[PDB]
Amino acid sequence: AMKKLAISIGDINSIGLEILVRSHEELSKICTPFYFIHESLLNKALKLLNLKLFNAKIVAFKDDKDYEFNFIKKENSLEIYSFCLPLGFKVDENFEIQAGEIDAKSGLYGFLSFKAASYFVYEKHAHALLTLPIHKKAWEDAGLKYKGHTDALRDFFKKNAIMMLGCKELFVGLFSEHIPLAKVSKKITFKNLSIFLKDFYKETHFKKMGLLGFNPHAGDYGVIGGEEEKIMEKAIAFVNAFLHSKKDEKFFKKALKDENLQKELLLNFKGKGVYLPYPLVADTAFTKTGLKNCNRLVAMYHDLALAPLKALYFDKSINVSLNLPIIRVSVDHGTAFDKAYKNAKINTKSYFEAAKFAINLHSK
Amino acid sequence: AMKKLAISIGDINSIGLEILVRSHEELSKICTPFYFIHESLLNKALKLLNLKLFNAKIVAFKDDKDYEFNFIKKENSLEIYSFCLPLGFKVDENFEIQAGEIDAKSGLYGFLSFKAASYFVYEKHAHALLTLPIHKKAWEDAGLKYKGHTDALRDFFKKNAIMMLGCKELFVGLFSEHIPLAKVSKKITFKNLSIFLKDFYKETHFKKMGLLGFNPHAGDYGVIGGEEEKIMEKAIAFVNAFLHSKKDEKFFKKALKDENLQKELLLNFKGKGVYLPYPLVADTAFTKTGLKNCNRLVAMYHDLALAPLKALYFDKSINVSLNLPIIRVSVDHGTAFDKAYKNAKINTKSYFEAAKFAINLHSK
Numbered sequence A, B: 001a002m003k004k005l006a007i008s009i010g011d012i013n014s015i016g017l018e019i020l021v022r023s024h025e026e027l028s029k030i031c032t033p034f035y036f037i038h039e040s041l042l043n044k045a046l047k048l049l050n051l052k053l054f055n056a057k058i059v060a061f062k063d064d065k066d067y068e069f070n071f072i073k074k075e076n077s078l079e080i081y082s083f084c085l086p087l088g089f090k091v092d093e094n095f096e097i098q099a100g101e102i103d104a105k106s107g108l109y110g111f112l113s114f115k116a117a118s119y120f121v122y123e124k125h126a127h128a129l130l131t132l133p134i135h136k137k138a139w140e141d142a143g144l145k146y147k148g149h150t151d152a153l154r155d156f157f158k159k160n161a162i163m164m165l166g167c168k169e170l171f172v173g174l175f176s177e178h179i180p181l182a183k184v185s186k187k188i189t190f191k192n193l194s195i196f197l198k199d200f201y202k203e204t205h206f207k208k209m210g211l212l213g214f215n216p217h218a219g220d221y222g223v224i225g226g227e228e229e230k231i232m233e234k235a236i237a238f239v240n241a242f243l244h245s246k247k248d249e250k251f252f253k254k255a256l257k258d259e260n261l262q263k264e265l266l267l268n269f270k271g272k273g274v275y276l277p278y279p280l281v282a283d284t285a286f287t288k289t290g291l292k293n294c295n296r297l298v299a300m301y302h303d304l305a306l307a308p309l310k311a312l313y314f315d316k317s318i319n320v321s322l323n324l325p326i327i328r329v330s331v332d333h334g335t336a337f338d339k340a341y342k343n344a345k346i347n348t349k350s351y352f353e354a355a356k357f358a359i360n361l362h363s364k
């Protein structure tokens, strides 16, 4: 029944640790969590929060040339493990907590917690990775070249993750993420969109998915631009027909370049496909009746997803990195970074959602 | 105590009539509706709907050189009036209703109903205008040159309407509407945005408004584009200052062209203005707490407004045309156009809200 969940602690100067601790008792009832944190630091946060922690497994990570994972000892109802791995940085746990502040020390430490946990999951010691949020500016101050988890995951695993946001009532894949909105149009090409729609299906197996119009009213039958939507349509038909045919990546790469071959594929395609054939109008897409028609969406750009999504599911909304060799989930900071260790009230709903999501998937 | 409310019937072949008729008893309790429809066509609708209509005021309208507004007879508890005016086309009520169909004759009729109702309001015979939806394609087939209400209202009154969607919980002004999204960026200029925000304020008097970022995360301090946001800031700072100064239109046109004049205004009228100084992040803007912070917003593009607002306020959300010599409101098509006169369930909640909003306004 119990799957091992690897949890990287994020920036210790934020509300990450509080979430972790307050949630521990309920979380241990649904999976076995391993927390990537050394005891000395764990205790600094505990004392500062004035909370206690029972029956938890923590993993002290260290830089070594080889992989090695061992149970070491029990202590204060605490189970301590070590994981040695090639990190490329010397772990330094001896610094103080500085509530809500940007700091090179805790920056590097959290980057390392995450790197250690990611490879822990990659080596199959746990079933999935959950990352608590980090502050990119402390990474920057630590002299790291990465811009966030995704960038680091691309470097570790050489794959470009697909982001999917939301929860059971509504998930949305993002064709593009943190790029300026004036750049998104030229990125919507037949080649790129086809690869994305193929990978997104393979990664999720959703049975009925819909693309959101890029233009108002999905272009309104060509009167409000509509050029992007023609491309979307062409990509849907071709992906639909290709998934139905059960042919391989080699055929795909070849057919992406040959219209006559795409055409042959479309003429032989005798199914309803997995993607709706025509882009959705955003006006209708996030209403109750819209959501009942389709609740697995693909958005060409960041805000089309975020605005409606956070208006409905502020609490339970998770971030899911698809297309990597590990299952990785996350949550959004949500509050102000700087406003932490102050008994400010906290929402642990999304932490639980993200966990249950990962637990529910099949082994990679 | 009641104000007079002109109501144009939209496309008689759609659900407009039924809304009008199902709503009349309850509406007459808050205002005095004047419906713009000839008797013989009203009856064809009543019959086809199989409903009756009690103590309702209807205004037949006619092409003519002069503006004249007359009472004529009472009938089936049905006060019939005359309104003659320079319409441009010969009115023609002699046509049969075609349930849910595009037709030149109900299209042309519906345009004429609206033109009459609009001038009725301008010539002060009523307080406000409420337009029931039309179908742009029936307008096209009738040979009209206009693409919609706003298009025509610009021609009637030589003013560019500013559009505002929502309800008392949330209003969004639209800096652009049905233009291709790839084209929105170039349209965000200091000149155009300042005029917009000046007119938006003058028209609404809202004491606290926010602009929503164009780029994800409001450009994240210049890391995700940010160019558009610099321009927002520059406009916000200038308009705010102009509005405190109490200076006039002539000055404003002069100060738009001259950086030093702008600096002088900014030095003299520093201070919190009616616009928040920084664009808002769309992630946070539509949540409980966000809305509690600010609930009067301005969006740079159509879908940023439509998608979260229809997720929250599907039933109650209205359309308001600001910046015209008359008050004019409207609602969006509930159902598909196709499904009129079927006995499908019909939502009247926004019709009421729209009327409620107009009454609750001062005269013009």
Ligand code: NI
Binding pocket: A178, A302, B216, B217
């Ligand atoms: Ni984001």
Ligand code: NI
Binding pocket: A216, A217, B178, B302
């Ligand atoms: Ni629209």
